[PDB]
Design a protein around this ligand. Structure first.
Ligand code: MG
Ligand code: MG
Ligand code: MG
Ligand code: MG
Length: 58
RNA sequence: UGAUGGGGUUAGCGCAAGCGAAGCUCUUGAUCGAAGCCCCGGUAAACGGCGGCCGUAACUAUAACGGUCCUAAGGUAGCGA
């Protein structure tokens, strides 16, 4: 068994990048569920609007 | 309560194994037989009991929601380390 830590970030990117971090996160979890890798969130970095995330650590 | 049935006895009859009248007596328990119980409803300010699992919301989180399993019904208001 392996445990790892990864971060998905918008860097210095604009709000669109801040938003795609969220969409990519949702897809990433919707794949981790089928892969059987349990996922937990350590630091969700909410973005500059609704529904945005600057970065999230899994 | 005592119907039938099966015995025990013996007057008689039998070469004689045996049959057995009536009476008496032993046993059997047909029929009758109410409550109760089973049965059918009521009743919890009667004694009492008052559920599981799983998923689910433009972001993560939670589940308003949904699926099926069971129950007699799944803890209402209110309160809650
Ligand atoms: Mg999602
Ligand atoms: Mg009632
Ligand atoms: Mg309540
Ligand atoms: Mg305390």
């Amino acid at each position: 068994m392996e445990e790892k830590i990864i971060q998905i970030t918008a860097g210095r990117g604009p709000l669109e990048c801040q938003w795609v971090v969220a969409k990519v996160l949702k897809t990433f979890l919707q794949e981790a569920t089928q892969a059987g890798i349990s996922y937990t969130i350590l630091s969700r970095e909410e973005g500059d609007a609704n529904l945005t995330v600057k970065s999230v650590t899994l």
